[PDB]
Structures are given as structure tokens and as C-alpha cells.
């Protein structure tokens, strides 16, 4: 009943969104939008604004909320995708959790079989831990927001389903994140001035627990771990819609290196005061330019949360002129709004 | 030390702001912007984004940070006002805390005598407690944000200093806020399932400590306290720049009533998950509808915080067409961005 209330709250607060019933999901009020790729994500609740605050022109067309920390059921995904299809196909953005993977996979298959053109981008940006509690491979965290914006802008510009998917997949190969917690959400137990280093957004254990000395020293280790765990080879599944089947591809991520230009996301995991995030960003810019990385754009705030956890995360995403044009492109959503 | 880092972070993150040193304050990078009334506010740190996140076109022209919870010293106010003066005068927005009142009055007299056209608006929107720890009368809280926007928009459009001031004062007479905390920032202590009802943003005590049954019941009593404490007469002091002196004015607030149209702000005091804020909004609209108030616009999120305090606040502001037009007018700040 508390979930239903919050979703009703969202719908009342934002008449540009529509709340659907049996099954529950959220779409742009003007969806389906003819002639553009439709973007769709979803996942466990308690990560707000992700994903419902990202619905709107230049970003998502809809989102499927699940229960707390559990994935949306595939009926929601299926029904949501058919709602938003504008005749150019639907692109499904899936964070790398086993539940999300099972469910989005189920929906995708049925979707293709019902005449909907569809494919998928898997997000696996968290550098900290391979094979966490609810993941095979690497967890999907705050980089989803950056990709949702950039592919959102591509789709909105009129790019095709394949071009948006290739962009999404390429970006997933160049974004890196890590997060820390000084105290669990309401799940696990820390000593005083101890942190969980490399924490998940569902409260999953990190690399270890270790002492907290200062804000600056933490950002340093976080930044160092981004470079140290930067390199990664793994297999990802994508729907091939021409063959109508799952196509395993092998991909490699290169670590960030001297000369790279980046978008930086300093993300409140729930209970970190904004003032502290700006301190984080002060230290992050210093490290970046010592490492020859230019931060071209930033987001600082609460974008990918883990209920009311005390902690924060850093995300660095390699970009170029084309990607910045997509960054600077208009976006009109509850959580992100700029441009005409 | 930590404060300097946060402010440097702010400055690096927003090239449209300028961080001044000796003394410390923040202005729009293009200040002074000639030919518009300049808006200036300030106060203790730990209310982020209030006020530095509100510096920008259509809102504040600069802001003065103090130490944590303590007011900024008059040198910062005086230099900041001088920096932002575009020759139409400066309007100083002052939340009602004895430190703020004192420091801003000092700076004001001195500004007048140095050739700057200047006047003041006092915010006293917190309905819960008369004569708190650091206040004579009622505390100034989240309604400041709505007034900064609406008065910001009037300045941007080209309205005279007097007109902006009158608008400010009138809005101050029509806005109502109340807050609650389920846990203190890091100052005071609650048993489990207990709340501080009518808390200040500096952790001043509320009306009392009382049981937290459920989220809906809390909003109900908050909304009821907006109506019960709605009525309020008191004396406020304003700078009269034509006579060059302080001018006392008795003013009275009507409570909200059936037929009123309002802007609603549901504000995270720092550690309340956004999902819970939408639940609050849901209950608030139901209660408003029953009382025959129409909510015409809303803001939901962290706009006036008290570091990492666990709670939220509700602010309702009585509006009409002219005011809604000012609401819809463009705003371009770190914290609020919309329009062309």
C-alpha cells in the first residue's frame, strides 16, 4: 500500500507522466510518440528518481517499477513496451542483475514474437566486485543515468534502433563507477569510522570494510580503484532482432587513460548532504587533472539511490564531441531538465 | 577547512558562478548584471542548495555563506551587495534568525550610506513555534525558496526595487511551513517511532516530541497545524530607502482557506528518500482537495536542508495568475532550471 501511494504521488505531482493499472507501469503522457525509438528501463524500487524521474522528452518513454530491490515482473515490461512503441522499435535498458536479466529477457523474446522490433543494452559499470549477491559479472549502477540521457538524446534526434543500441553498448564499455557506504539503508552493520568499500546499491557487500579517515582519502581510493579495476573482459547477451535470437558477444573495457575527456557523476546514495558531494567533486577534479583527464560535464546530486543509505558514488564516462552534443541536447523529465 | 573545499567544489562544478575571496561570497559570473534589481540572500551553511544553488538568471544574483548554522558576517553581505549592484538597487532577503537580522541590518544601513539603493524582505514562514532558540517571532524556512524564485522572476522581467520588495513582503504574508524530524542531523535525541513535531532547520526543538504512527497520519497533523497556526500578527522591520531609516510595520497573515490556489513544496530535510516524499505528496493533495485548496504547482525534493537530518517539511504558498506567471518564467540555476 505504501508503494501504490508513492506512485500515485508521482502521478499527481507530474501530469506529464501516466500511471497505468493492471499491470502497474509508467509512461510519458504523450506516448506512443510516432517516428522515434522508444526507450524503456525498470528495476527494483528504492532507487528513485531512477527510473521514473527519467521519463520524458529526450530520455525514457516509460519505466517499470518492481517491488523494493526486486526486479519488475515481465508482464509489466511487455505491457509497457507495447504502450510506448512508436513504430521504430523499442530499446530496453537493463542493469546487470540476475532478476532483471531473467525478466527483461522473457519480455524481449515475447515482444519480438508479437511483432515489436526490439533490442537490449546491458549496463555493468560497477568496478568493485565480480559475481556479487544478485549478479553474474559486474553490477549496474549510476552510469545507467548517463546512458539513458545520451541514448535518449540519440533516439529523440531520430537515430535508428541499431544506432541507439550501438551507442548504448559503446557507452557501457567506457563508463566506470564505484561507491561507498558509511552506514546501511533500512540491512548490514558497520563499525564507527568504518566504511563498506565498493558497496552495491541493493546493500550488497563491497570489496571489504575498511577505515574511514577523511573525505579526500576516500575519494582518492575510489578514484584509484576506478583506474585499477578499469580493465574488464566479459560476455554479454544481446537480442539480435534479424535472426530473432540471443547473440553472445565478447567485449572488453579499457581503463580510463591520460588524455581522455569525461562526464563525471557524483551521486548521493541517499543520506549524504549535498555540501559533502561538492567536497567530493573538489577532490575528484584535482585527481582527474593530475591524471590528465578533462571533466567536460558533471552531475552532482541524488540520481541513483539505495533508499536512505549514507554513502556516495563516483562515475566517470569517456566521451567525445558527438557525445557532448548529445549531453547538451534538450531533456525534459522530473529529475533532469535543460534546453528548449 | 572542509567548508573551503565544498565551496571550491561548487565553483569548479559551476563555471557560471564566481567564488570571491577576502571576504568569501558567491555571485553570478557575469555580475553585476546592469539594468535589473539584484537579489541577494545568505545564511548558515548546511542548508544546501540554499542559497548557492539558487544563484543565477531568474533568481539570486549572489549569496553569502556563513559557517555551519551561523549567519554570515556583515563584511560578506556588504561586499557581495556591492559586487551585484546593477544600478537598479539590491534587495536583501533575510530569514528570521536573530544573527541574520543583525548582520543584514548592519550591512543595509551601511550600503544605503555608500550610495546603494537597497531594501529588505524578512521571511518568517515556520508556523510551529514563536520565539525559538535563535529567533524572535517565527523561523524562516523553505518558503524562502519559493519567494526567491517568484521575486527573482519579477526582477528579471524588469520590475522596480519597490515592486520586488512589495511582492516579497506580500508573499511572505501568504506562505506557511512546518517540519518534522524522525532523527537529528550530525544535536538531539528521539526514542524509536518518535518524532520532533515542528522542528527548526537548525535542529531547534519543535512543538513537542510525539509518536510516529504512520506517514499519512504525520502529514495530516502537519497539514492541520498549517491551518490552526495559519493566523499570525507581528511587527517586522524594513529599510525605508527614501527616508533612510528602519521602518516598523505591523502585518497579519490569514490562514489558508477554501478557494485558495497554492504552490506546494515537499522538502527533504536531508535523509528522507525521495520515494517517501511522493507518498507525502499523495496525502497532501487529498487533504488539500478536501479543504478546497487547489495545488497549482509543486516542488518535491531537497530544497532547504538541515545537513543530514531525517525528516521533511511542507510549505504551502497562496498564489494567483500573476504569481503563476512568475512561477512559469524561466529560471537557470544549479538547483532549479526551466524555460528558454
UniProtKB/Swiss-Prot annotation, chains A, B:
Binding site for dihydroxyacetone: 44-47, 95, 100
Induction statement: Activated by DhaR.
Swiss-Prot/TrEMBL catalytic activity: dihydroxyacetone + phosphoenolpyruvate = dihydroxyacetone phosphate + pyruvate
Active site: 47, 202
Keywords: Glycerol metabolism, Kinase, Transferase
Source taxon at top rank: Bacteria
InterPro entries linked to this entry: DhaK_1, DhaK_dom, Dihydroxyacetone_Kinase
Domain DhaK: 1-336
EC numbers on record: 2.7.1.121
Alphabetical list of PROSITE patterns matching this protein: DHAK (PS51481)
Regulation: Inhibited by chloro-3-hydroxyacetone and D,L-glyceraldehyde.
Annotated TM spans: none
Protein's GO biological process: carbohydrate phosphorylation; DNA damage response; glycerol catabolic process; glycerol to glycerone phosphate metabolic process; ketone catabolic process; monosaccharide catabolic process; pyruvate metabolic process
GO CC annotations, alphabetized: cytosol; transferase complex
Pathway(s) served: Polyol metabolism; glycerol degradation
Top class in the EC scheme: transferase
Any one GO molecular-function label of the UniProt entry: protein homodimerization activity
Biological role stated in the UniProt entry: Dihydroxyacetone binding subunit of the dihydroxyacetone kinase, which is responsible for the phosphoenolpyruvate (PEP)-dependent phosphorylation of dihydroxyacetone via a phosphoryl group transfer from DhaL-ATP. Binds covalently dihydroxyacetone in hemiaminal linkage. DhaK also acts as corepressor of the transcription activator DhaR by binding to the sensor domain of DhaR. In the presence of dihydroxyacetone, DhaL-ADP displaces DhaK and stimulates DhaR activity. In the absence of dihydroxyacetone, DhaL-ADP is converted by the PTS to DhaL-ATP, which does not bind to DhaR.
Record-linked PANTHER family: TRIOKINASE/FMN CYCLASE, TRIOKINASE_FMN CYCLASE
Miscellaneous section: Unlike the carbohydrate-specific transporters of the PTS, the complex DhaKML has no transport activity.
The protein's assembly and partners: Homodimer. The dihydroxyacetone kinase complex is composed of a homodimer of DhaM, a homodimer of DhaK and the subunit DhaL. DhaL also forms a complex with DhaR.
Protein name (database record): PEP-dependent dihydroxyacetone kinase, dihydroxyacetone-binding subunit DhaK
Gene behind this protein: dhaK
